[PDB]
Design a protein around this ligand. Structure first.
Ligand SMILES: Nc1ncnc2c1ncn2[C@@H]1O[C@H](COP(=O)(O)OP(=O)(O)O)[C@@H](O)[C@H]1O
Ligand SMILES: Nc1ncnc2c1ncn2[C@@H]1O[C@H](COP(=O)(O)OP(=O)(O)O)[C@@H](O)[C@H]1O
Ligand SMILES: [Mg+2]
Ligand SMILES: [Mg+2]
Lengths: 328, 12, 328
């Protein structure tokens, strides 16, 4: 009813030059006539909410993995998309892609443009308040990417109740241009004290948060929805927060333990609602098709298959003004 | 009738 | 207590070339040792909240007529300043001056810069929502200066209750630069269908509205204050809305009539709160010192002397969230 499976979508990228050079074969198949929902490796078939082949465009991935999320956030649901997989499998290409390229822009910039296109096309007399945060998690410590003096931030939980990173910048935005400025500022700050971004980004989690509140000016109905967009550290062997993420999924998936270890990492505390709580969650598992990476691919697929059995329980986040509470 | 985006500004 | 006299401040400009050319004398005196609060003409002394001589700078006028208003609006009071006087007496120079000139910028741009300087210098964890409207009233009809298709707008009164111009643009701003862009857009639109601005601006009322809401993030206290900044049509003989403005002041000043004719014009309906209601109001009466204009100067002074006896009753405009109403 309000009961919502975590969606899991699987994306294979093309075999690349280091793979071919090392003599890798393409070891994965895609059964046809089954809605593009299947992938087979070494004889074993997995079923996901969507499987994307190496040729799938960014627009196709967006239209299937992500689009519904902007419509949901604009209706007052929390939304979360994260990308998971071994380093070099395609997580950043999926989550960010090449910003500003019409073909190769990833999920985040498309989501940003779509939020504002939808708002501009609404007739209803609505007022939107949008703010974004952008931070990194590395070795279980949080660095604010929009304010270099805010390092080692803490995770807290608010009134009613819901976690938050206390002290994290919250930047108001009112056009897609304002958002992309914020993203550029974040990316640039991420380079402070980092000698090799390729290696450092492969070992830390990049968290982009869009908080969208709305007030309906005709009936005073207030709705809010948080959109978490996360590019995770590589899943290869085994980042301590990723162990925690797997233990969380494993516990919710077994469903037979009183204690879900959300507190085992700041990442899983921040994603607590996304993992078995009040958000519509999509995980993009990213995979190489190369024989060389087959065992890592199989762990990725097995992670996604377990997550796909977790159930979230979601509702519209409605707040009441006075008139409801007033009249009582 | 149009949807508007607010432009709050902080202190703290 | 909450009982607040309409402040009246009187500003004389220098004798100008057309005045000297026509053989005008300087016919006004300023008694010293009485706090600069007096002006005498033909033997008759008037007392105001401040009198400014022809040499008074824009900064001096602002520091006395206006500054307190930004502090008030930021504390949740409504604030209104209007300029009144015969064409060529100094109303536009007072209200707007030369925008962008550090010396000659008038009350509006100083108010704009000050609002944002105060916000930036607050420590309290506060969130401000600021929107501006800019419209003209000509022959009792309202034209929106920020949206050329919105002509002939109506005056309505809201829930709790308070008038408003229905349909008038409301532009969100979040820096002084955003405000001055809006002002430039307004000024430029005002020229549509006007063949001579000097004559047309002398016969219409220019209304600049800054609406400032704030939410205190620590205690959920919500405050709001409207700032009306109005440059009126010339007071010479006798714009129908100015007759209405005088009849309103005359009625509140006599205090002995059940019916204040606020509805006699859209101007006095919009200013209803400013005239005997819930706002801190300052009127700048602007006057020429020239013998040639003496009879018009005396009407202006007599208007200001009557307005200065009107009492406003003001309070902080506090709104309650849920927690107050919730718990009951
Ligand atoms: N579907 C794809 N099509 C083409 N190139 C891709 C695809 N996915 C990833 N790439 C490229 O492969 C390399 C590794 O991808 P990246 O997204 O950086 O991996 P990760 O972020 O998971 O380490 C990057 O150069 C990226 O451009
Ligand atoms: N205090 C002053 N000092 C110098 N010049 C002034 C002063 N007040 C008005 N002026 C000038 O006198 C002229 C008429 O003033 P303006 O403000 O346009 O009059 P109004 O708007 O009342 O018709 C304008 O050129 C203005 O620059
Ligand atoms: Mg990456
Ligand atoms: Mg003028």
């Amino acid at each position: 009813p309000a009961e919502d499976s975590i969606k899991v979508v699987c994306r294979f990228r093309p075999l690349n030059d280091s793979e071919e050079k090392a003599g890798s074969k393409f070891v994965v198949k895609f059964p046809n006539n089954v809605e593009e929902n299947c992938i087979s490796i070494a004889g074993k078939v997995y079923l996901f909410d969507k499987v994307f082949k190496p040729n799938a465009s960014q627009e196709k991935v967006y239209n299937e993995a992500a689009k519904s999320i902007v419509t949901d956030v604009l209706a007052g649901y929390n939304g979360t998309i994260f990308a998971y997989g071994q380093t070099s499998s395609g997580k950043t290409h999926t989550m960010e892609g090449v910003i500003g390229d019409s073909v190769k822009q990833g999920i985040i910039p498309r989501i940003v443009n779509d939020i504002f296109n939808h708002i501009y096309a609404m007739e209803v007399n609505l007022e939107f308040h949008i703010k974004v945060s952008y931070y990194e998690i590395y070795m279980d410590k949080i660095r604010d990417l929009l304010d270099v003096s805010k390092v080692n931030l803490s995770v807290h939980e608010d009134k009613n109740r819901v976690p938050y990173v206390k002290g994290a910048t919250e930047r108001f935005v009112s056009s897609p241009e304002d958002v992309f400025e914020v993203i550029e500022e974040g990316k640039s700050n991420r380079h402070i004290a980092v000698t090799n971004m390729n290696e450092h980004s492969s070992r830390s989690h990049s968290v982009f948060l869009i908080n969208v509140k709305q007030e309906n000016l005709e009936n005073q109905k207030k709705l809010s929805g948080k959109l978490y967009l996360v590019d995770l550290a590589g899943s290869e062997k085994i980042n301590k927060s990723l162990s925690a993420l797997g233990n969380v999924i494993s516990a919710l998936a077994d469903g037979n333990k009183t204690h879900i270890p959300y507190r085992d990492s700041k990442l899983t505390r921040i994603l607590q609602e996304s993992l078995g709580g009040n958000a519509r969650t999509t995980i993009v598992i990213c995979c190489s098709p190369a024989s060389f990476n087959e065992s890592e691919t199989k762990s990725t697929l097995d992670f996604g298959r377990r997550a796909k059995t977790v159930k979230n329980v979601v509702c519209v986040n409605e707040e009441l003004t006075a008139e409801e509470w007033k009249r009582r | 009738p149009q949807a508007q985006i607010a432009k709050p500004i902080r202190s703290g």
